[PDB]
Amino acid sequence: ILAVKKNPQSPMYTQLGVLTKGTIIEVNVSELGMVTAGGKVVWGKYAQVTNEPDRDGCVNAVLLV
Amino acid sequence: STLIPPPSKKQKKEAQLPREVAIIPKDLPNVSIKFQALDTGDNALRVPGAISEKQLEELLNQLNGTSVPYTFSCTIKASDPYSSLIKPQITLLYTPRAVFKVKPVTRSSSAIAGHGSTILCSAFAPHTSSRMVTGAGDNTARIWDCDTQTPMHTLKGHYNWVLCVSWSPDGEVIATGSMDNTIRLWDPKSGQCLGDALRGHSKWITSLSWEPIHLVKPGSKPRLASSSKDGTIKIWDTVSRVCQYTMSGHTNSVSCVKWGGQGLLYSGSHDRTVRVWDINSQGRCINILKSHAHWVNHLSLSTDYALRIGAFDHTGKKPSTPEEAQKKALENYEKICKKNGNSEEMMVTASDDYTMFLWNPLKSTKPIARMTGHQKLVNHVAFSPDGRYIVSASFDNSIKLWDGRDGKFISTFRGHVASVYQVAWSSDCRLLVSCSKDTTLKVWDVRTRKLSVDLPGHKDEVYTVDWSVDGKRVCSGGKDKMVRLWTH
Amino acid sequence: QNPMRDLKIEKLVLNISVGESGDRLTRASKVLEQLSGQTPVQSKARYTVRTFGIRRNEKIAVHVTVRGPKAEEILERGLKVKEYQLRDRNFSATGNFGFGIDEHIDLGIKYDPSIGIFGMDFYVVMNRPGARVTRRKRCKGTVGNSHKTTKEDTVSWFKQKYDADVLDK
Amino acid sequence: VQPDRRWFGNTRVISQDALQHFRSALGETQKDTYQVLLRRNKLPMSLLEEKDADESPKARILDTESYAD
Amino acid sequence: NARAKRALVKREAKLVENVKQALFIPGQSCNKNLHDIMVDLSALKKPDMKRFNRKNDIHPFEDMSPLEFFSEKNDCSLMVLMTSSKKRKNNMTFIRTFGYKIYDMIELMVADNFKLLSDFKKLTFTVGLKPMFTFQGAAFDTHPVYKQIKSLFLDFFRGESTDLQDVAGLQHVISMTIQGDFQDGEPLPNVLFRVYKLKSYKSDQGGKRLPRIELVEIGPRLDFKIGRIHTPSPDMVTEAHKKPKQKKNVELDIMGDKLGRIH
Amino acid sequence: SAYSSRFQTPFRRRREGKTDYYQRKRLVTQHKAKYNTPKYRLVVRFTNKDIICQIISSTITGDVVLAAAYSHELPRYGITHGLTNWAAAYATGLLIARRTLQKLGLDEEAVEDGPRPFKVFLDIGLQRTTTGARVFGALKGASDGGLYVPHSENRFPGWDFETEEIDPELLRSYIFGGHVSQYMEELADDDEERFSELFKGYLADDIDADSLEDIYTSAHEAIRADPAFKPTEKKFTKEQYAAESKKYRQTKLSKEERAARVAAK
Amino acid sequence: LPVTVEKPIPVVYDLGNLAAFDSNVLDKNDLDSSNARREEKIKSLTRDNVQLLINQLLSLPMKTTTESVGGTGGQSSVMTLLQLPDPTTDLPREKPLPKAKAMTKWEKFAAKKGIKPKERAGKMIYDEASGEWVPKWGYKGANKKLDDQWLVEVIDPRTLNRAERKRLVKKNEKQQRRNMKN
RNA sequence: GGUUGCGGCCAUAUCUACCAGAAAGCACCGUUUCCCGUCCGAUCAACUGUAGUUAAGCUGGUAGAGCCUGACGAGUAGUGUAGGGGCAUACGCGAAACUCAGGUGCUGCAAUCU
RNA sequence: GAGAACAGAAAUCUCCAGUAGAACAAAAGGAAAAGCCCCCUUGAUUUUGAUUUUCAGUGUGAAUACAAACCAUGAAAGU
């Protein structure tokens, strides 16, 4: 996990870095290696948490591509 | 956009201060030097000064009475390839330069809205790079005029995907293996199927191997060898379209087959077995090799490149009669094959188990060397046109270079970020162009194993690329359903 | 000598000004479409005067060009009604001439009340070969003083054909 | 959450040329006990890492032959 | 309306200053030779060159306000006004402006032996390329007047301050020389101004690393006589040398890692 | 009177519709602040019956031309018909590109540098920008001749206005005189008066839709083979040309005669 | 033909501005404007100085990118370029540094108070009874919603809201004018 | 020496009323299958070089308004500079108008001309 | 100015020119546009190299300063 940019519902949680499913967070996507136009390989994209980490021991997110 | 750490005040102070100069006109040091041909010839002792490299290169010319320029290298730990002479007895070596230099391909070009399907294969014509053909998901193959970057007559007749397409070494008849069961023949100007399609094949065609021109007798057209998932290779007569014999030794799909210059068809198969079938043997196996842990995914030979040109060297001058064309093919094959004095077409087999094997089918079945330095399956392995260098592409996002004869590791490229698909070799071996699952095309400088330039523009999934025989232009194709050309 | 100084018709211009905007403007547009066959265009008032009640952008006129061979037929039909004559005036300094009469429906056009009473005015521009110099972009040149058309020359040209007269004497 | 030209937009793209410099620095970087780190830069260490440590682990034999066979 | 705001943004002081704009004002005595000299100077100053509409009757020494007014209204830092009097034949004035206020004034005159660009051999010349400079003689750095002249010439012709230069960009060089050395207290010898085009003769003697540099003179050939001179006060000099201000045991190691020394 | 005094006419090349200084400013007002990279401004002009294409770097001395070509040089490769057509513009662009490539010695000051491909930029001229214009055809031919001018296929023939695609078959046909070849047949099967006044040379030479394409291909091959750019005989040397020309041109009368005539008033 | 150049006094170079200084003795005997050799001597001296500067200049590092033409702001890999060092000559400035800033009362209050600066999240505010974001300001925002809505249940009150907004804008302008005197 | 593409200062270059222009080249023209835009294939987009030209454009020559240049004013007007005295001299920069004389364009690369 | 059915001194329609009393917001010595017409259109985007401020002193959580991409637009230079 790279960072958290925008948590709705009082983004003071964003300042606190809480997951709070529904947040948008940056993830190191270097593994996939997708390259945008111009030859500038991309290695980081913002993703939204899909599952509820509070009620589960794993964190799931979907790339916002 | 990440920023490289800017130079600190110390760096600025160091840069602002002048430093040494490269005029080097005075006080040239002198050290003993020896000459020895890179391949076999050991020798012309001298103790010259730090003279220009051109003078040293011309010194050896009169020694052999050739007038030809030769590439020069020394210390072959040091690994040293005035600037070179100031590093310190240096043992110098020489080898032909192949003065014809392919200019690097850097500039892109507009796309062509041709067949609307994912590209599957492509190959340049041997007689001239101006004409090129691409295969795609669409059942119809199309030729392209590289000069104007426009499509040509459509090869109608196929009803399934054209898995493989490639010009014959003489360029008279193009072969386009169809996915379903058949391979069709198309001359450069037919615009329609030449006679009945080659049928009677139980499974899809995996690869094609044309008969080398240097083995083709005058008048008779070259034979067309085919490989398929059925595990058998059929030898087809281009004239009568009849099959002389079929070998079913391979118990699984034949991954690929190459028609060697000695008349032996080196082919690999999913059964983890390599069978050296030969036409001269009336379709019989002379020897069988079994050393790969996994199955063989690709095959290549040192002399394979010389076969595909069909005597059409970089000049592109077409021959007059079949006899002189065959003679010029044979002389070139001997030149490339007889690099180490004797004619020895080295062979390399690609193993999916992160390993590659070096093979000498003309000698004992003991492997020469076990090239094994990859982390993922090597999709493609191809010998350098010169033959002294071996390169391979793998899904591990890296391209590895190996010695042509001794098998020693040389270097590895890491520019690609995704799985690396098939690659192409420049006509002069100076540059290598590779394509990967990533939507980028890159070319690597063999002289120093460094990234030369990046050639993006493809939408995604650039499956294959090829290099023109003359080196003027480089083609490409991918899943974007758009063919893109590249030139210096 | 007259090697290439032959008078030629450039284009015919037709227009119908209106006392208001709305249904009458659409009627004028339909009249233009049925007469010249050209798509209607909108001519907007440059300013508000309040004397005629027209406000800014009143859309009180429809400028249409009648260039082409059809210009000769329309001009002939119009001149036929007007006693085949034009006044000594109505000719500009360059010789361009025009006119206008009531009840455009008189010259063949149907009497159907959908259009109703609708007059018209005409404006004709004349020039000699080589006018593209002043209309082309590259090498935009001048016009020779002699080459410029004159009132007397255009009057003589209009009198030679169509059997017209000055209407004044 | 409001739609916009935000996320679904590129934000972390690295420069192609800088990758070679980062790899060279990683290969050449060296430190001593008297030198300490205060802020470790965030870079695609995965691309920089995995140098030429050619070992080629054992083949996936199970792929050629399953347990049942 | 945004168009005016964009111009005003450039008018305001910038942390990084662009190329100093130059305004050329023809004086009441703008001789035809003076006009040719102005055209030649503009040829080496384009595209950042501006010429006034017509003649003028402004005396920088006897009237400083008009120059400041013109600089403020045109946002031009460098000002040139050519005017030749009976005593000061072929005199040309150069002025710098700091914050729209007069910075310094120097009178430069060209001898009759000057050769125009058209007189020299025709050669290729690209506008906007930064030329090279060479200063000969210790007086350039060891004298106040010569130092000021050198600084003015550099600011006039140094162009942009880019840190990356193309090899082919070195098209021509400007040779700054003086009419021989002089003893302390002696009259200042005239400054010799020359422009030479560069020719890349092969490196036969110099191996491959460096080619044999060759020069072809294209002009204009000018000898700059020194007349009346004005200099700014020390406070103005200090103000003109301000910096934007843009760490014990703190260093950014390679890869951006923040390392330090324990000692 | 006052208007004539208190005004200044536009530039000499701006009064006439020869050069648009607005484009010149942009092509010369590069900042640049990035590198001292030179430039080579392309020049393409279409006159009556002829096409002129040139590469001219900006220079105060007069923009000395490094290479140039003209349509009237096409007959050197056997092409005479349709000198002003789209195919002729493409051929001229290809010819000029190949000529500059050969004379610059790329293939059959930058010491220690590698092969640097040439770069060129298109010029607006005074032709309205519309897709399919012959200016874009000349640009395409020049690019195909070994030039990497930055360009987009938006204005190439066959471009689809409704959707951002293009048909390469139409472009190939136009390069091989597709429109002209089709119109030849569409006039042969139509009224002959137009096909007898126009295309008279085509009828005389017996050129069909395929012969024209073959001729264009052969001309392109010859252009690739021999761009040597051999000029005319250049007889009638300069001095005698000048002597002959002065016979008709009216020279300025001697001021003495004018003064005498004025006094004779 | 020979490229060797040397002088007794070491030459001073300014690679940041493509300039150099030569404090060597000037030959007054030949530099006289009346002499004919003057031009040749000046040409030779300029050639030597340019040769020295080029020899020193070319010693600098050169960048070699792996990218292509790409966008208009890109750079070609083929074009080798010399990385010049930072400028050394301290040329005089043309304008002063605008370090002065606005001393508005808001900054002092924020410094005194614990109110952190706003994060400028976005223009997309949320509203009700419309099923749309209806951003606060920027396009048909809620500011004009009160005027647009056709029911003002509570003399024309629609114009009163606009008058109040204009008065607030005037108060903001007055505050700007007052702070301009800081 | 003419014409054409790019150009150098941008009125010696323009404007007013006339006359000349062979060869070669612009320009004029003739046409609308298609790319293409306008109400109008007039500008613009495309085709022909054929039909029809010096009538126009453009380049030149004639006599009017300005323009530009050199010297005459002229080291002349003005100005603070130093005390005879309550302005002159001493002493640096330094005009314009006016007068006299001159012209109403030149200039490089490439292509094409009798 | 010549003029153009109603239409005239202000409705429309064509030849010349405002050295450009249009708007170039404008105050000022002053353009094949910066005034009008047809197409697109975000922008309050991203990291963080000088300044502050906490309250788990939180690699910035952030506007200001600026860096280098992204975008529009075009055939391209370009802004």
Coordinates of N, CA, C and O in Angstrom, one line a residue, chain B residues 1-2 4 272 293-294 353-354 372-375 400 409 412 414-415 417 442 454, chain D residues 13-14 16 18 21 23 43 47 50-52 54-60 63-64:
Chain B
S1 N 5.2 12.3 -11.7 CA 6.5 12.2 -12.4 C 7.7 12.3 -11.4 O 8.0 13.4 -10.9
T2 N 8.3 11.1 -11.1 CA 9.4 11.1 -10.2 C 10.6 11.9 -10.7 O 10.9 12.0 -11.9
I4 N 14.8 12.7 -10.5 CA 16.1 12.2 -10.1 C 16.6 13.2 -9.1 O 16.5 14.4 -9.3
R272 N 8.9 -33.6 -25.0 CA 10.2 -33.4 -24.4 C 11.3 -34.2 -25.1 O 12.2 -34.7 -24.5
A293 N 14.1 -31.0 -19.2 CA 13.2 -31.3 -18.2 C 11.7 -31.1 -18.6 O 10.9 -32.0 -18.4
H294 N 11.4 -30.0 -19.1 CA 10.1 -29.7 -19.7 C 10.2 -30.0 -21.2 O 11.2 -30.5 -21.7
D353 N 11.6 -24.9 -19.0 CA 12.0 -24.9 -17.6 C 13.1 -24.0 -17.3 O 14.1 -24.4 -16.7
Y354 N 13.0 -22.7 -17.7 CA 14.0 -21.7 -17.4 C 15.4 -22.1 -17.8 O 16.4 -21.7 -17.2
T372 N 21.4 -22.0 -18.6 CA 20.3 -22.0 -17.6 C 20.5 -20.8 -16.7 O 21.3 -20.9 -15.8
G373 N 19.9 -19.6 -17.0 CA 20.0 -18.5 -16.2 C 18.7 -17.7 -16.1 O 18.7 -16.5 -15.6
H374 N 17.6 -18.2 -16.6 CA 16.3 -17.5 -16.7 C 15.5 -17.9 -15.4 O 15.8 -18.8 -14.7
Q375 N 14.5 -17.0 -15.2 CA 13.5 -17.3 -14.1 C 12.1 -17.7 -14.6 O 11.3 -18.2 -13.8
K400 N 18.3 -12.2 -22.2 CA 19.6 -12.6 -21.9 C 20.4 -13.0 -23.1 O 19.9 -13.5 -24.1
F409 N 27.7 -17.0 -20.2 CA 26.8 -15.9 -20.1 C 27.5 -14.6 -20.4 O 28.7 -14.3 -20.1
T412 N 22.4 -9.4 -19.6 CA 20.9 -9.5 -19.5 C 20.3 -8.1 -19.6 O 20.7 -7.2 -18.9
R414 N 16.9 -5.7 -19.0 CA 15.8 -5.6 -18.1 C 14.9 -4.4 -18.4 O 14.1 -3.9 -17.5
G415 N 15.0 -3.9 -19.6 CA 14.1 -2.7 -20.0 C 12.6 -3.1 -20.0 O 11.8 -2.3 -19.6
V417 N 9.1 -4.5 -19.1 CA 8.4 -4.7 -17.8 C 7.4 -5.8 -17.7 O 7.0 -6.2 -16.6
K442 N 11.4 -2.0 -28.0 CA 12.7 -1.5 -27.6 C 13.7 -2.2 -28.4 O 13.5 -3.3 -28.9
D454 N 13.5 3.7 -27.1 CA 12.2 3.1 -26.9 C 11.2 3.5 -28.0 O 11.2 4.7 -28.4
Chain D
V13 N 3.3 7.6 -12.6 CA 4.1 7.1 -13.7 C 5.6 7.5 -13.5 O 5.9 8.6 -13.1
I14 N 6.4 6.5 -13.6 CA 7.9 6.7 -13.5 C 8.5 7.0 -14.9 O 7.8 6.7 -15.9
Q16 N 11.1 6.5 -17.9 CA 11.8 5.3 -18.5 C 13.3 5.5 -18.4 O 14.0 4.5 -18.0
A18 N 15.0 7.2 -16.1 CA 15.4 7.1 -14.7 C 15.6 5.7 -14.2 O 16.3 5.5 -13.2
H21 N 19.3 4.6 -14.4 CA 20.0 5.3 -13.3 C 19.8 4.7 -12.0 O 20.7 4.5 -11.2
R23 N 18.8 1.6 -11.3 CA 19.4 0.3 -11.3 C 20.9 0.4 -11.0 O 21.5 -0.3 -10.2
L43 N 10.7 3.9 -4.4 CA 11.0 3.6 -5.8 C 10.6 2.2 -6.1 O 10.5 1.4 -5.2
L47 N 11.7 -3.7 -9.9 CA 12.4 -3.6 -11.1 C 13.9 -3.4 -10.9 O 14.7 -4.1 -11.6
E50 N 16.3 -8.1 -8.3 CA 16.3 -9.2 -9.2 C 17.4 -9.0 -10.3 O 17.2 -9.0 -11.5
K51 N 18.6 -8.9 -9.8 CA 19.8 -8.7 -10.7 C 20.2 -10.1 -11.3 O 19.4 -11.1 -11.1
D52 N 21.3 -10.1 -12.0 CA 21.7 -11.3 -12.7 C 22.2 -12.4 -11.7 O 23.4 -12.8 -11.7
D54 N 21.7 -15.7 -11.7 CA 21.3 -16.8 -12.5 C 21.4 -18.1 -11.7 O 22.5 -18.6 -11.4
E55 N 20.3 -18.7 -11.3 CA 20.3 -20.0 -10.6 C 19.3 -21.0 -11.3 O 19.6 -22.2 -11.3
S56 N 18.3 -20.4 -11.9 CA 17.3 -21.2 -12.6 C 16.8 -22.4 -11.8 O 17.2 -23.5 -12.0
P57 N 16.0 -22.2 -10.8 CA 15.5 -23.3 -9.9 C 15.0 -24.4 -10.7 O 14.7 -24.4 -11.9
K58 N 14.8 -25.5 -10.0 CA 14.4 -26.8 -10.6 C 13.1 -26.6 -11.4 O 12.3 -25.7 -11.2
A59 N 13.0 -27.5 -12.4 CA 11.8 -27.4 -13.3 C 10.5 -27.8 -12.6 O 10.5 -28.5 -11.6
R60 N 9.4 -27.4 -13.2 CA 8.1 -27.7 -12.7 C 7.7 -29.1 -13.3 O 7.0 -29.2 -14.3
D63 N 4.0 -30.3 -13.8 CA 3.3 -29.9 -15.0 C 3.4 -30.9 -16.1 O 2.4 -31.2 -16.8
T64 N 4.6 -31.5 -16.3 CA 4.7 -32.6 -17.3 C 4.0 -33.8 -16.9 O 3.5 -34.6 -17.8

